[PDB]
Amino acid sequence: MIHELLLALSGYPGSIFTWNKRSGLQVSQDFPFLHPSETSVLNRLCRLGTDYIRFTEFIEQYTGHVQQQQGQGGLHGIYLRAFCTGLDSV
Amino acid sequence: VLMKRSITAPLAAHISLVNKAAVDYFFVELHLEAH
Amino acid sequence: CYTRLSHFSLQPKGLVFQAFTSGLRRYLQYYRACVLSTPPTLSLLTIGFLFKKLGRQLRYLAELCGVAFPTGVKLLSYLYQEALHNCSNEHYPVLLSLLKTSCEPYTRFIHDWVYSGVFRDAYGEFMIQVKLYWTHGYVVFLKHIAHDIYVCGKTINLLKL
Amino acid sequence: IRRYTDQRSLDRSFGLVGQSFCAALHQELREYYRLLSVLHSQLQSLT
Amino acid sequence: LVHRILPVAASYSAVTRFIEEKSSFEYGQVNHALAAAMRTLVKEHLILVSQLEQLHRQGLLSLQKLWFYIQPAMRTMDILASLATSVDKGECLGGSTLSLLHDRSFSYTGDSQAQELCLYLTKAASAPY
Secondary structure, eight states: OHHHHHHHHTTSOOSSSOOBTTTBSOOOOOOSSOOHHHHHHHHHHHHHHHHHHHHHHHHHHHSSOOOOOOOOTTTSOHHHHHHHHHHHHO | OOSOSSSSHHHHHHHHHHHHHHHHHIIIIIOTTTO | OHHHHHTTOOOOOOHHHHHHHHHHHHHHHHHHHHTTTSOSSOOHHHHHHHHHHTHHHHHHHHHHTTOOOOOTHHHHHHHHHHHHHOSSSTTHHHHHHHHHHHSHHHHHHHHHHTTTOOOOOSSSOOSOOOOOSOOOOOOOOOHHHHHHHHHHHHHHHHHTO | OHHHHHHGGGOSSSOHHHHHHHHHHHHHHHHHHHHHHHHHHTOOOOO | OHHHHHHHHHHHHHHHHHHHHTOSSOSOHHHHHHHHHHHHHHHHHHHHHHHHHHHHHTTOOOHHHHHHHHHHHHHHHHHHHHHHHHHHHTTOOTTTTTTHHHHHHHHOOSSOTTHHHHHHHHHHHTTTO
16 A cells, blocks of 8 residues: 555556546555545545646657657647646646 | 858858859960950 | 667768767767666666656657668758757757767868869768769759859869869 | 896907997996886885 | 676777787888887876776775776777777788878768877878888
């Protein structure tokens, strides 16, 4: 439970927080260890890492992936690159 | 912009003097103007 | 992929191609030198943290190379256009440092048929290549100077008489 | 060298040349001793 | 890491042997000049090794410092060892190793660290000629 929370939080998918692209990180919700009091707090902490994964994946996706051989304006752009560069420093 | 626009100036500066001296090399030595 | 970049570089063609490969090997050493001088062993998370903002700059060069592949002017122009393509990212100084030495042999070459009268062409990197003594052939670079050097060197071959 | 330059230096059967050659060889040894004198003292190593 | 330090060593001993085998009374004119001009670079290599010698005397050195130390010297030893290999291989002497010293200086035009090296030995070798 100790390093498991941080590895889920670090943006690498957990082994108790099962990564879905349609339900994010989600605790297993049926083990003998968990009880409702810690459970809801764990689920609240899950959502921030869920967002962080999409953020870093977006940044990796739209920055530094082209040699510039055309091109699409929402899949590329000088503004998209500037956006991602700002986002990681935030 | 990443292009040569300050190194190419001392290059065209030599190209021009070369061509001027050759056109001069005709007239004031081999007398193409007399031809 | 660091290993397969050293696995990509090997040299004892083209002169500018050799200069480009040696400049790449001058960066692989830096990547090996930075490890064991900041990050030996720290928290487990710190290593994945430190070499994500550092590793991606290395990983762009795998996209850049063939990790067939351009040689000659086809390299020296394409890499030139990679300057104007990317100038506003983390991959601007590595492309800049590569182009600054991939044009290092060619700038000396141009400096020869203008001054001393020596025409240099031994790899097909030189642009101008093939009675009134002027029958020379001619069939990115700034086209403002491309025909200029063609007429300026044929002139020097006449002043050498 | 040193055996030959010891022997021939006072030899008059060998003539003037050879005492002169010995003088040359002594002068070469003079520059060789000054190095060795430093090298003994700077031992502490000396590779 | 110990295996990575070895190329300056194999390109030192080789560099020494060219100065030891070709100190003989006969060979070509340029090669006799070149031996006395390559030994100068062996001495300037030693002044860095002399700093290293003092440091090793004071009960201190580590492998990471040493690896960082020998990165500048490796290239100079590489250039000298390649020159020694080429001069011995081609059976060139006299003036035909004044051609090789002339060609190798033109060949390097991307860094000019080794171009100047071939230039220095050629400027020393053309002084008696």
